[PDB]
Amino acid sequence: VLIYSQMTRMIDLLEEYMVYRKHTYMRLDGSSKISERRDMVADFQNRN
DNA sequence: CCGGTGCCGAGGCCGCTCAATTGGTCGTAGACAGCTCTAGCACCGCTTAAACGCACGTACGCGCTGTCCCCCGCGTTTTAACCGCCAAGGGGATTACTCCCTAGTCTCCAGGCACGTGTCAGATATATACATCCTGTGCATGTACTCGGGATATTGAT
Q1: CA A11 to CA A21: how far, in whole Å?
Q2: Family per UniProt?
Q3: Distance separating alpha carbons of residues A19 and A15, to the nearest angstrom
Q4: Which residues lie closer than 8 Å to A37 by C-beta, 6 or more apart?
Q5: DSSP assignment of A4-26, as one string?
Q6: How many angstroms separate the CA of A3 from the C1' of B24?
Q7: DSSP structural state of residue A46
Q8: What nucleotide is nearest A8 when CA is compared to C1'?
């Protein structure tokens, strides 16, 4: 599943919840650097 | 004719999205702690010898203390050149970029002068007798301050 949101505040609350429950949490927002983006995007193919 | 109302244009709100800043971690290497004599050496203990520092009177001037008179300060007035503010033209110091080059590193080399010791001798402290140059005192007089009156500037207003 790919969850899409808009508000960073919302995203943060969602993060808090995804840390409360253990479903893993991988994000790539606009505040993330381009290198971190590229990294996560390489991971999300060829990683499960 | 004027007025309601749609259409368009602008102002206001909110929010990311992205690019620039600054404290935290890794890491390695030359330099602050710290014996180790040593080493000879200043510092301390232990003596006296001489003189300067200190205190007591005591003589003797140089600071505080009281009285008249004008000269400088206080206080007012008007007015004017200057201070302070504002505004516009333009030059030049600023900022950023590429290119050149000599500072910086370190390496190697080596001969000149800092630096210490050893030797010895003459320049300098020191004591005493000699004596004369400088210093306090006293006193004549003249260069210079002061007052008064006539030159030559030296500013301001027509």
Answers
A1: 15
A2: Belongs to the SNF2/RAD54 helicase family.
A3: 6
A4: A28
A5: ----HHHHHHHHHHHHHTTS---
A6: 33
A7: S
A8: B16
